[PDB]
Amino acid sequence: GTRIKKISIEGNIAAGKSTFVNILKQLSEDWEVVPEPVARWSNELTMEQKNGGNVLQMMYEKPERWSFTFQTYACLSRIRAQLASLNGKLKDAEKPVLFFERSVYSDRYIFASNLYESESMNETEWTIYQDWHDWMNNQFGQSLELDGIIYLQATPETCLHRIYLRGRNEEQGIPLEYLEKLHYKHESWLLHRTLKTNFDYLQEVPILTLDVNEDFKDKYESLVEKVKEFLSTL
Amino acid sequence: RIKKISIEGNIAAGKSTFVNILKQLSEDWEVVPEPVARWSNELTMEQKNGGNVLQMMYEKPERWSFTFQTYACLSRIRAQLASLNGKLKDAEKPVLFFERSVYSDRYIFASNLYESESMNETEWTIYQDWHDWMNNQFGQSLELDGIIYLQATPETCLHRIYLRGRNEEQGIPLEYLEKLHYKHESWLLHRTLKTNFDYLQEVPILTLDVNEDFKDKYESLVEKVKEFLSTL
Ligand SMILES: CCCc1sc(-c2ccc(OC)c(OCCF)c2)nc1CSc1nc(N)cc(N)n1
Ligand SMILES: CCCc1sc(-c2ccc(OC)c(OCCF)c2)nc1CSc1nc(N)cc(N)n1
Ligand SMILES: O=c1ccn([C@@H]2O[C@H](COP(=O)(O)OP(=O)(O)O)[C@@H](O)[C@H]2O)c(=O)[nH]1
Numbered sequence A: 001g002t003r004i005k006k007i008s009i010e011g012n013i014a015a016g017k018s019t020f021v022n023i024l025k026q027l028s029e030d031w032e033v034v035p036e037p038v039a040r041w042s043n044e045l046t047m048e049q050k051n052g053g054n055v056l057q058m059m060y061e062k063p064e065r066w067s068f069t070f071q072t073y074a075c076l077s078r079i080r081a082q083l084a085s086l087n088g089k090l091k092d093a094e095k096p097v098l099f100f101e102r103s104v105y106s107d108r109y110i111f112a113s114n115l116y117e118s119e120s121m122n123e124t125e126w127t128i129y130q131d132w133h134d135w136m137n138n139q140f141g142q143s144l145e146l147d148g149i150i151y152l153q154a155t156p157e158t159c160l161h162r163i164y165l166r167g168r169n170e171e172q173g174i175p176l177e178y179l180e181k182l183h184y185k186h187e188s189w190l191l192h193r194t195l196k197t198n199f200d201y202l203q204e205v206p207i208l209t210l211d212v213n214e215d216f217k218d219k220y221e222s223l224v225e226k227v228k229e230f231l232s233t234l
Numbered sequence B: 001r002i003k004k005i006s007i008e009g010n011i012a013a014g015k016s017t018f019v020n021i022l023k024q025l026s027e028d029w030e031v032v033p034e035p036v037a038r039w040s041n042e043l044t045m046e047q048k049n050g051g052n053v054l055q056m057m058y059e060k061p062e063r064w065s066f067t068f069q070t071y072a073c074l075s076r077i078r079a080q081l082a083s084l085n086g087k088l089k090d091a092e093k094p095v096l097f098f099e100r101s102v103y104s105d106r107y108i109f110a111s112n113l114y115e116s117e118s119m120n121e122t123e124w125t126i127y128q129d130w131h132d133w134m135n136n137q138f139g140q141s142l143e144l145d146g147i148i149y150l151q152a153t154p155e156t157c158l159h160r161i162y163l164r165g166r167n168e169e170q171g172i173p174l175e176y177l178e179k180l181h182y183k184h185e186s187w188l189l190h191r192t193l194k195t196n197f198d199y200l201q202e203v204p205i206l207t208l209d210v211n212e213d214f215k216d217k218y219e220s221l222v223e224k225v226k227e228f229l230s231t232l
């Protein structure tokens, strides 16, 4: 609650997070966005951006070799970009809100978790990652800890179509069944609420859930109405 | 007020033996063993993780070097914190002796592995980026007051690996020891090597010749440490 509110936008690949955050950011000078490091890698530029494309391209080619390296770097860059904007942006605001394109928790409990369950990380890779994940996200008092979560809910089919509409040459190859396992794990943690995390407060952190199957680029008012209503109870 | 002194040197050159001798000499003197050495042997998940990843590292360094280097250093950083925030309370003249450092992690072993092609440019540039920042947020109060360099030849070292009897190590060739030997000379003797940590340019170094056996004859090495600490 102090002082900038921190909300994560969560949803499957191409569910629409980046459209929706670009939408939200224009609606209030009190609202700003921290976009996904991985989402920018997918496109001279900087060191991380250089590294990102490489590990991203290698992740696509042989994920059982690169998942640990990709995951730990994706998480670091996220922690870096969020911490930066936390003090950086929104210095003068009555009601400041930082929207995150995904969280350190999706990094682990959706993406890293699935890669493990899918045999792209062996047990020692998953234990090392989790250990590294703990120690560090436990070094941050209550600073990146979220006040809420906006789950952008979709079908894997909507997500499959919106990948080809997006037209990322490497992403075209992502299968429907992959989207499904990620989808199932999103529903699990956010909607059904099965998944237990190693972070205590998460079971109590408010969750707003939004079906986004219908194109919203021209018709977002009801969505944004649900954003504003949710933010006034936190 | 706690003084931080890193003890550096090649494998088997005698570092653990040294700090073990030193810790017994003063209530005010404490020690942080290097985690890789802890794994180089019930216990914890770190031991389990480090046990497994060291074995992997021995079988296929080209696959496991990045992961291993990330984990060796995170485990060290943490180990050094728990000493600094829970040991030497609240002595008159505290000195904590780290067995190696995050600098020897990066500028000796990780660099050496990249030169020997066990990491590619991506891995090494990811590691350094990781290293420049993991130290920044979490590892600031770990800044070194001084460094002690235990200097022994690669042959001395091969003999000592033989003496120590770790069978996992009994296949480490002379050649490898010879590599790590150069890395230390350029950093700690010739003082050539440049780093991104600028305080590490000033840092006082003391060099000690440990080619002769010292388990029953260390009094003159300890005098130089005591002298070196007073200059600080
Ligand atoms: C969508 C771009 C990033 C990629 S690429 C990828 C992938 C690519 C090829 C694959 O098989 C050939 C693959 O299968 C993994 C094994 F099932 C995953 N998964 C992913 C998702 S893992 C991930 N972790 C994060 N922490 C963040 C994030 N955005 N994505
Ligand atoms: C003492 C056991 C740790 C090992 S194992 C190892 C190694 C073993 C077998 C190898 O070839 C098959 C090998 O080859 C490297 C490429 F020539 C390295 N190097 C090392 C040194 S890497 C290291 N990094 C650290 N950061 C710390 C530390 N103590 N050691
Ligand atoms: O209502 C929508 C939402 C998204 N998109 C498109 O779907 C693709 C994927 O959306 P986005 O990149 O925002 O998904 P993310 O991966 O960020 O969740 C993009 O080309 C969007 O332009 C669309 O046509 N209509």
Ligand SMILES: O=c1ccn([C@@H]2O[C@H](COP(=O)(O)OP(=O)(O)O)[C@@H](O)[C@H]2O)c(=O)[nH]1
Pocket (backbone or CB within 6 Å): B009, B010, B011, B012, B013, B014, B015, B016, B017, B018, B160, B161, B163, B164, B210, B212, B213, B214, B215
């Ligand atoms: O002066 C010495 C130094 C070392 N050693 C032996 O060399 C082996 C390796 O030394 P240590 O474990 O201290 O080396 P490190 O790897 O820590 O530098 C040990 O079994 C010691 O008993 C010795 O006998 N005399």
